[PDB]
Design a protein around this ligand. Sequence first.
Ligand SMILES: Cc1[nH]nc(C(=O)Nc2cnc3[nH]c(-c4ccccc4)cc3c2)c1C
Length: 291
Amino acid sequence: NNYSYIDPTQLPYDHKWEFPRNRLSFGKTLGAGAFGKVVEATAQGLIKSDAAMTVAVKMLKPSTEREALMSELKVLSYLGNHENIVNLLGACTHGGPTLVITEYCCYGDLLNFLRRKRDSFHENALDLEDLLSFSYQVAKGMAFLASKNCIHRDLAARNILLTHGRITKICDFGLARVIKNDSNYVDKARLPVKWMAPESIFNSVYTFESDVWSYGIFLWELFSLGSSPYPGMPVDSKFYKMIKEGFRMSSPEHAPAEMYDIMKTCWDADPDKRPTFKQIVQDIEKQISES
Ligand SMILES: Cc1[nH]nc(C(=O)Nc2cnc3[nH]c(-c4ccccc4)cc3c2)c1C
């Protein structure tokens, strides 16, 4: 067909984000692993008052990773500002290695935060109300992504950062896609198998419902205070068979029955059966009201 919905992520990079490399001062390395490394930095000229502020810069080492950073930057540029997404401040794409500048989140990733706070569980401590809040905020951020026809494809506790105010922000949009034109997205690198829906493993298809499956696994990490999914189970032929057979993880220790009910429905083999992020948001909001 000669008519198509236009994908903003495919459009050329908008230079409104362009930031001079000279105005950045790199500090210590905040993280490594999946996509390059993130370094804390000081940026000047971002404020209307010309003050300097602390920012996080994502970069790669010196070619799928090169495009994934550019893809993440464009997805963020299209998404816009949201409370529950890591916010894009600027980018450096001229005269050097590509740099993506985002807001700095003090607490770091949610997975490491829940492990650090596991012993303390139940003023700086963690309790069940924090876990419900985390569930709700991430659901809100996800429901926002869906409203923009966007799929994260890598939702997990490691990809949620905690900022001041006990606010959670989703990050790491390198695998994220916009599926407006087609209802299903088909991929042809390394993937987070423990977080993937079955149709995504077996048939390589990603949808809004595959993002919901990943959300359910996230809830399992959340209410087990940062435990690894499918504990002690390597990714092998036995694991794939059990998932196809319908074997799911059991309820984490701290999770309320109602929250486990949501995990189960996120894990339904049939994508149509799974709830939407809009419905999850509603469900969690009613559960919080009962307190
Ligand atoms: C493009 C893009 N997508 N996603 C990020 C991202 O991940 N940005 C971002 C923000 N704030 C952070 N704080 C920390 C941290 C805090 C305390 C201790 C250790 C680490 C890491 C980190 C990363 C970026 C950039």
